[PDB]
Amino acid sequence: QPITRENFDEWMIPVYAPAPFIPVRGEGSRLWDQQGKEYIDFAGGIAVNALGHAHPELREALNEQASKFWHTGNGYTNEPVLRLAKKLIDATFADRVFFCNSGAEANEAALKLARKFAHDRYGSHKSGIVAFKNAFHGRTLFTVSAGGQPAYSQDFAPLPADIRHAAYNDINSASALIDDSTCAVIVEPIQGEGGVVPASNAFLQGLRELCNRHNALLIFDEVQTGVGRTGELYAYMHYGVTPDLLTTAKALGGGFPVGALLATEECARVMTVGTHGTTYGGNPLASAVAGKVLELINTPEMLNGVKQRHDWFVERLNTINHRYGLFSEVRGLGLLIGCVLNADYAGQAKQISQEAAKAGVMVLIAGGNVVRFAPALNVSEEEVTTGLDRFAAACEHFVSR
Amino acid sequence: QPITRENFDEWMIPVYAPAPFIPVRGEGSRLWDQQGKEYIDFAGGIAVNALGHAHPELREALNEQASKFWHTGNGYTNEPVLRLAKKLIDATFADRVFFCNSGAEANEAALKLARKFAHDRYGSHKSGIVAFKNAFHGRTLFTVSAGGQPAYSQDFAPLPADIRHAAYNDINSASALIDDSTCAVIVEPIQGEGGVVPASNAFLQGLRELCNRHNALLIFDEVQTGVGRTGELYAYMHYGVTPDLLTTAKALGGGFPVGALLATEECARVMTVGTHGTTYGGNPLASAVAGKVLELINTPEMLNGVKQRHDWFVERLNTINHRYGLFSEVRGLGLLIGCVLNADYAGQAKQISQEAAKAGVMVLIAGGNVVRFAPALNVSEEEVTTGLDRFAAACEHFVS
Ligand SMILES: *Cc1c(COP(=O)(O)O)cnc(C)c1O
Ligand SMILES: *Cc1c(COP(=O)(O)O)cnc(C)c1O
Ligand SMILES: [Mg+2]
Ligand SMILES: [Mg+2]
Ligand code: NA
Ligand code: NA
């Protein structure tokens, strides 16, 4: 059965325009297409493949649970999901956990819980959600209404009401929207899709005190920043500000579809029998893989390793920048890194990313003006250097093209 | 340390009260708990495990793709997901496919599409969704609002507006709510959670005619009825009524998390670049497993074997009933079957399910009044008979 890139244009609902080449296998941070062409993968599954492609221990954990059973639905619990839940509890501020299949699902759960909590303790009039312009929280109607790209919601109106958007990093802007009718504030600790913008420490403490004063739940959407991405297990640990609810997905599963809502006891108590659920969520196959991911990522050597790899990327992006004058700045934390184009190259991140693919390196964008790097947290130093040589070659061609 | 059932009550957010025992491995339609106790599984992963537990070809397909790569995200397509798309297109009214990770994400995609379609062609104001009381379409705010059980949506208001609910199987009920302002009519061909109640043929044909007259998209939610469950690949084929959009998940991936929206070319055209998305949807791992599920399920022999199995359950359930006087009726289609409790035992489905489980057979409920069977499509004759023996012994303990 022959499969060609032109078949994509015929068979898929056309919401993505993907690369002209089709990957068939990978290993660590290398990936190969149907013709044998090789790419260093700095796109990292969009900050999902925290341990790279075809990781041998993730494969062994997959196969070992797959040969026992995969799924029953949540009428029956299972050992891997319980052990996963306990790892998450032991490692974070959480007392309890809910599992689902994607970051949007995790965010739906955290916003539902915040609505119910407010309604049960104060009255059903306390429904307001404050989110931030340029945030990304998912594609379901509710989560795309919470995110701050109105282009991604207007077509699907009427939207769920009582949501409004403050400017990121702007505490007065947030303060104007949060009041005693607010149930939740949802914020990414780094706006990933929004250009790799880190929140400042004052901004997050400011949301924590505003949530305290007005009794609203503070929700950190760590679906991109989570699971080692920043050099700590979760970003809130880097920042020292503790949320009431934390969502996690993407790198949680190292590539297997999984996500989770982390909650304090007080918040968890609110969600009684039958008030929420999911058919696939919490199956033992997901749970056995995520379990293994946490075991391999949440170690001092791997997390310090992410701080080390940060500097490899940044020192070398600086020398590339010295040669080609492309970027006003390089920002981010750990291995979520954005290269901000300057005025002479404004809105050209995607063209750079396409040249980079031609030169055999996968990178992402973050809005049209930022080139994004989200490589595997175990990428090797050889893979970082060879991928950046290719990125530097692609920048050279670009600077004439 | 060792995991206990009690840990479940300390660590999980308490949305489910799961069984007292904890499964640890299974094969076909048998499953075993941590103490070695054996169950015949007629729950079938809530109509998900169409091939049973730990299926060796599903395993082989999983491990073979897992040794190439699992995931890139949708900036790059892959061969498994394109092959799976083609299988679905060749086998259904669909021309194009979107992939996601759950039946709710599938229904989100479908309702979004019908919104944009109507908006783009008619205007901002044509936004109405008609759904049916007792429907279940998932747990995202939008899908749980489309669902017809207000008890699962109320707490999370305000709910997305322009949604209304008609009485299932009631053509004039639906006709009253569907006008030129309706963008979509979503409906399950058999209501699963709402008691294993099949649509009638005139009801579906009637929704199709009304959708056509008022230019609204007809969405079939086949996440429970689809992929072989009724004895045809999709229940629409059984009824002979073709939707514009169809959603599928659960049995799609035989236990691996996957879902999909099937669309006609005209409908697919409205979703341009960046208008919807998913990080994990269409990954090659789910795609490889779901491809192999379709290969094994969509065969004359598996599907005719589902018709046969229907008659094994119904004939023996009628025999059990004749003996114990529990139910007023055994209904459903294929291997989605509900035993409706009589007046005397009304509201007791869960107690009969708990008794079943003590006797070594897993069954589900569908509302407090129906006992629901949704076993693997390849359940063997011997599994049906041993599980139904243990169901008989459970009905006997229960009836007293
Ligand atoms: C990608 C992402 C989501 C949504 O994830 P899916 O798994 O695509 O549903 C939510 N939040 C953030 C911060 C993300 O980067
Ligand atoms: C279970 C189910 C859904 C929701 O699927 P999830 O994978 O649980 O999100 C939607 N529709 C029907 C008919 C279902 O049975
Ligand atoms: Mg309540
Ligand atoms: Mg448009
Ligand atoms: Na904790
Ligand atoms: Na077709």
Residue numbers in the entry:
A (entry chain B): 3 to 403
B (entry chain A): 3 to 402
What's in the article?
Escherichia coli possesses two acyl ornithine aminotransferases, one catabolic (AstC) and the other anabolic (ArgD), that participate in L-arginine metabolism. The arginine-succinyl transferase pathway of E. coli provides nitrogen for growth via a series of succinylated intermediates. In conclusion, the E. coli AstC protein, involved in arginine catabolism, is a PLP containing transaminase that is structurally similar to the related protein ArgD, which is the transaminase enzyme used in arginine synthesis. From the biochemical data, it appears that AstC and ArgD are biochemically similar, consistent with the ability of astC to complement an argD deletion.
Crystals of holo-AstC diffracted to a higher resolution than the apo-protein (2.20 Å). There are four independent protomers in the asymmetric unit in the C2 crystal form, two full dimers, each protomer being almost equally resolved. The electron density for these residues is unambiguous in all of the PLP-bound structures of AstC and the A protomer of the PLP-free structure. In the AstC structures, the loop 277–282 ventures into the catalytic site of the neighboring protomer and makes important interactions to the cofactor (the distance from the Thr281 backbone nitrogen to an oxygen of PLP varies from 2.75 to 3.10 Å and the hydroxyl of Thr281 has a hydrogen bond of 2.5 to 3.0 Å to a phosphate oxygen). Dynamic light scattering indicates a hydrodynamic radius mean value 4.5 nm, indicative of a molecular weight of approximately 100 kDa (data not shown), suggesting that AstC is also a dimer in solution. SO, ORN and AO were docked into the active site of the structure with PLP covalently bound to Lys252, while αKG was docked into the non-covalently bound pyridoxamine phosphate structure.
